[PDB]
Amino acid sequence: RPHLKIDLVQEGLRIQIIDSQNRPMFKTGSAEVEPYMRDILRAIAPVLNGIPNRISLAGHTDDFPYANGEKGYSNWELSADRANASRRELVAGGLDNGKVLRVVGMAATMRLSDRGPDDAINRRISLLVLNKQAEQAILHH
């Protein structure tokens, strides 16, 4: 059973989804979120509604490339699709309108460092509960 890891960062609250068996939370090349991940995402949505802050959603991939592999569909499209896939699950969980400020596709640029040598663990999404400083930053860009 997967769990959320929530800790403080400069930009606010970072939320990571972590599986105990170090199992990838997405099938390779897939932006379909699994039933187990579905439940934990929908469950945290009312909590996010309580927190007056807005959120940023990020999608990630392993560094297994597509055939072209940046000319057409790539890890950029896939990571972005994973971000929005998690977004739709939060909404299904009852996430309020206007809670999302940003969806982000990171491809394989944000590599985890202490979660083992298997690159497949990077197939994931992450959440960021933005503080006022991070939000005002993003908005005035």
Ligand X SMILES: NC(=[NH2+])NCCC[C@H](N)C(=O)O
Question: Residues interacting with ligand X, by CB under 6 A?
Answer: 21-24, 26, 28-29, 61-62, 64, 66-67, 75, 78, 118, 120, 123
Choose between 14 and 115: whose C-beta lies nearer to a second copy.
14
Q: How far is CA 45 from CA 31, 103, 105, in A?
A: 19, 16, 21
Does the footprint of a second copy cover residue 42 (CB under 8 A)?
A: no
- Helix, strand, coil percent content, the chain, rounded in steps of 5: 35, 25, 45
Q: How far is CA 28 from CA 6, 75, 83, in A?
A: 26, 11, 15
Q: List the x/- string, 46-85, binding to a second copy by CB under 8 A.
A: -----------------------xxxx---xx-xxx-xx-
In the complex, which residues of this chain contact a second copy (CB under 8 A)? Answer: 9-11, 14, 69-72, 76-77, 79-81, 83-84, 87-88, 91-92, 97, 100-107, 109-110, 128, 137-141
